[PDB]
């Protein structure tokens, strides 16, 4: 239920979401999105009683902002197309 995904536009836009969310919290001041780097991890979350009904996803991203590397965890739900920043912290050293 985990897989590595690539770092094209959809993944970069997760990173921009994470930075936009992190900026709202302001723990690290105002950050400027740079890029998501590898590796990017995607977890598929299933409904408990479906067969293979996908509820949504959780992503673990390494994202540079304002030249600092952060670890961001995002959840994403079909149904509501809602994204939540679960966690944003750092700076971390590069993986």
From Swiss-Prot:
Covalent S-S links between cysteines: none
Keyword terms, alphabetized: Taste-modifying protein
Residues the UniProt record annotates as site (Blocking, abolishes the sweet taste): 40
Protein origin, superkingdom: Eukaryota
Pfam families per UniProt: Monellin
Keyword GTP-binding: no
Task performed by this protein: Taste-modifying protein; intensely sweet-tasting protein.
Subunit structure, as described in the record: Heterodimer of an A chain and a B chain.
Protein name, UniProt field: Monellin chain B
């Amino acid at each position: 239920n985990w897989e590595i995904i690539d770092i094209g536009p959809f993944t970069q836009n997760l990173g921009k979401f994470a930075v936009d969310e992190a900026n709202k919290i302001g723990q690290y001041g105002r950050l400027t999105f740079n890029k998501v780097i590898r590796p990017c991890m995607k977890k598929t979350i299933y409904e408990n009683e479906g067969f293979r009904e996908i509820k949504g996803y959780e992503y673990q991203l390494y994202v540079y902002a304002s030249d600092k590397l952060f670890r961001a965890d995002i959840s994403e739900d079909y149904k509501t197309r809602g994204r939540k920043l679960l966690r944003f912290n750092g700076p971390v050293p590069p993986p």
